[PDB]
Amino acid sequence: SSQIRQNYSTEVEAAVNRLVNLYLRASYTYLSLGFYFDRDDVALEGVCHFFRELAEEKREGAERLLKMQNQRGGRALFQDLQKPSQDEWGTTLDAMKAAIVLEKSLNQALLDLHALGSAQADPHLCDFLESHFLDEEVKLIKKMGDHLTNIQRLVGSQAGLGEYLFERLTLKH
Amino acid sequence: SSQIRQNYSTEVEAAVNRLVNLYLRASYTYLSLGFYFDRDDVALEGVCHFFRELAEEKREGAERLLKMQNQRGGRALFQDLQKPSQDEWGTTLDAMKAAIVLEKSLNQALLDLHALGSAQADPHLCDFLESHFLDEEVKLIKKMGDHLTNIQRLVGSQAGLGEYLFERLTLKH
Amino acid sequence: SSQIRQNYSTEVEAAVNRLVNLYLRASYTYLSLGFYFDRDDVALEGVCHFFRELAEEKREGAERLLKMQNQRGGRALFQDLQKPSQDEWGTTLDAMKAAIVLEKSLNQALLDLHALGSAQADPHLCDFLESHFLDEEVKLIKKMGDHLTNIQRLVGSQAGLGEYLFERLTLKH
Amino acid sequence: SSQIRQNYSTEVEAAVNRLVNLYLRASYTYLSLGFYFDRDDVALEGVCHFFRELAEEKREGAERLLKMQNQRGGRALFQDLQKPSQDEWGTTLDAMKAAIVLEKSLNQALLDLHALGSAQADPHLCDFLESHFLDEEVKLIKKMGDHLTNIQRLVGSQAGLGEYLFERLTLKH
Amino acid sequence: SSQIRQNYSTEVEAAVNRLVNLYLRASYTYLSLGFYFDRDDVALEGVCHFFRELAEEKREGAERLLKMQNQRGGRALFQDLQKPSQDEWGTTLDAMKAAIVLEKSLNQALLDLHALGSAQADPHLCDFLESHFLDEEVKLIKKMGDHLTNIQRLVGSQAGLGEYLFERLTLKH
Ligand SMILES: [Rh+]
Ligand SMILES: [Rh+]
Ligand SMILES: [Rh+]
Ligand SMILES: [Rh+]
Ligand SMILES: [Rh+]
Ligand SMILES: [Rh+]
Ligand SMILES: [Rh+]
Ligand SMILES: [Rh+]
Ligand SMILES: [Rh+]
Ligand SMILES: [Rh+]
Fold first, then answer.
1. D51: domain CATH number?
2. D87: Cβ–Cβ under 8 A, 6 or more apart, which residues?
3. Which residue of chain C is at minimal alpha-carbon distance from D170?
């Protein structure tokens, strides 16, 4: 390019690069979450596994965006990746709350990009986001909301017991 | 028909149509119960599965009745299907109580129909209800009573914990 | 929820609940159609099979909508299900005409919902309807139009003969 | 016996022997029907097959009754078997009408025997008739009624054509 | 070329290019015929299949000619492809008549080319037409003549019935 670029605005190109940064930031956040749950003084393997899988999914999301950027003739531009918001993530409940906040933020960014593409008359972009991002995000947020509810029901007056049981009976493979 | 109809009273034909409505109503009730347990703020997958399976069983029961109606030369007549008694179903305990009430009502309707058939000297009807309905209903009600007892034992002073454990350890496949 | 709900209007939530009622009503209509063709004085097995399969498809459509409602954080609300428009459905031709009228009505409801979602800036909804409903409906209506044409060609001056042949040579498996 | 006989009245024993004669008579009637359709000037193989299968089923019914008679300690007593009501059976329509008349007569005899057994407080008899006779008869009569309807629809103004098509497309394996 | 060209006249080269245009035109005609029979108000799947297969065969014929043109050192030259002679094709009978007219025209063009090749002393050309075109065309025209005869016999006084039966019992796979 510019030998292939067609109907692909500079605005959308810039927003795609920003979304890549957001997805890589989310991947980094999930990497931190996963290793926190691997600490010997935390030790919840099912929760390490849940977050490590999400780190992989977010990195895959970034790569799909980057591939799309190149398919349209746009140019990938990478920025610094800011460190995650916390160094320690508290309880499973605290972590799951932070994760849903994070996913809602990604979802809103996807919706904003879809709106931009619709405004720019870019149906390929709209289709691409629909096909590989919007429903995945909705399904993920539903799963996290389900988890949050189960974690909340388990707090009772025996929070340690509840945290163990949720990891053993819901999260662990 | 009337080319095949033999020993099949208008009373039994009408009661079969009413029973079809009752079974379809029960199927609809179980559909509502299943989706309630799928809500992100309820999130008890084993309970969604239990009730969704029952919705299927009740619809199958209605279809078996309708097939029998046609085999005897009776005429299926459908009525409005009233919506389920509740929009929200409370706890697993509340739902299981509502389900046993519902099944007892179906059972009583089957017993009433059997009595009508016996009064009408209709042994095919009596056999049909015996063969595919009465024992199924008894087995189902026993299972629900077993579940109720286990749910009740689990309430303790930690109801959330008990509700989670019953779903994980009894209901989930 | 409201812990997961995002970009999901009360208008769309209400319209989804109405569409569920429409699909369940259509399922009930096809149940009635199927059993009518099973009557000993009608006895067209291929036509029973065609309509019974459609009853299943419409119920599946309702369930997909209900699952989506929960994924978005909306709340399923069920209403009375009105009985089908007829108790007896006439000829295969009459039934197929009623079925296309019914499917066109479902299609229009889908189009209205898509328009609402587009107006509400809800791309997940738009995608969902596109992905699992709009093309299925178009394909189904085409098939029914094909059937209608073949049935119409077969009426001739020997309608009974034509009705038998269409059931034997087009509909029966 | 009388070493095993228990709760088995002379009335029921006599009625079982009469029912055996009725079933063997029906088997003989179906044998005649089958061979009539095998005549070179009739030549409807699907109709020969339908009636020959029924001859076998009726003989099996007689044998099940005779086995039951011996299991209860009753004594089989055979009478002359009267020849079938006709030597020539007309059209497929005529034959199917005669067959439904015949099956209705067997059904009524079964119902009469069930009533006798109920009056004699003979639950084994009632169960036996329910288990192997009443539903089989209902299913058979439904099938014949279905056939009659299809045959009737096919008469049109081209009866020969209709008779051929029904044999080829419904009856033939 | 001209490095390979040997015994290949400019006359034959030009006639091969014209025949390519004729075969592609025939392919286009069969494409139109196929989609006409797919219309919801025509709906004869066996006839769509028959003509769609012929569209493929004619395109293959054109490609074989083009390959031969290159093997001999001739130069493919493409011309505009005129649209088919009709937009709507009437009955199966009308379509089959148009198809035989079309195939006879292709056959005559093949015969004319063979005569040209014989006149030009071009045995490779003569062999090529014999090997892959002349017998295929004769076999195809025989099949179409067979179909025409069967369609004509079926018109009777019930043309719709006949058109359905021919599609179901001769054409459909
Ligand atoms: Rh996993
Ligand atoms: Rh979109
Ligand atoms: Rh299950
Ligand atoms: Rh009974
Ligand atoms: Rh099917
Ligand atoms: Rh859309
Ligand atoms: Rh058979
Ligand atoms: Rh009985
Ligand atoms: Rh083919
Ligand atoms: Rh030659």
1. 1.20.1260.10
2. D32
3. C168
